[PDB]
Design a binder for this molecule. Structure first.
Ligand code: LNL
Ligand code: GLP
Length: 133
């Protein structure tokens, strides 16, 4: 049910990422570089296991998980969180919990583009990714 998300995607638009990073306590110098970075995200499956790679000239991450099963994660900004990824309304919903805080990373396909919505506190960031062949 995750198959249309699979593949290699590149960032082509970003709105409010600085607000999102600042809400998470990311320092100004990291926000500055991040605001000019265009990651490539690779989403692959093997059976029930998804692997999500985020690559860039700055930070790089990789997670593997089963939908609906909690996993430990250490984020690009070094938060140690408890995570779960599920499908909800056709959207891939990633919830991170740490210190009583929460953030969601929600991916949906709209007109063939992958729209990533990042919410923490009041901050709502929308990042648009485009396929790669
Ligand atoms: C690996 C991500 C690459 C570049 C971004 C660099 C620093 C971002 C700063 C804080 C990380 C916040 C949590 C992760 C955001 C991922 C956004 C995305 O996948 O587009
Ligand atoms: N295992 C950790 C990750 O949990 C953390 O996310 C990352 C920070 O980002 P970067 O690797 O780009 O420094 O360092 C390691 O790879």
């Amino acid at each position: 049910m995750v198959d249309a998300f699979l593949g290699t995607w590149k960032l082509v638009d970003s709105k409010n990422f600085d607000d999102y990073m600042k809400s998470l306590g990311v320092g100004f110098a990291t926000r500055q570089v991040a605001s000019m970075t265009k990651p490539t995200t690779i989403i692959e499956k093997n059976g029930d296991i998804l692997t999500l790679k985020t690559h860039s000239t700055f930070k790089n991450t990789e997670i593997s998980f089963k939908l609906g099963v909690e996993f430990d994660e250490t984020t690009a900004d070094d938060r140690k969180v408890k995570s779960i990824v599920t499908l909800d309304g056709g959207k891939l919903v990633h919830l991170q919990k740490w210190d009583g805080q929460e953030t969601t990373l929600v991916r949906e396909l709209i007109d063939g583009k992958l729209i990533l919505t990042l919410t923490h506190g009041t901050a709502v960031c929308t990042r648009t990714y485009e396929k790669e062949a």
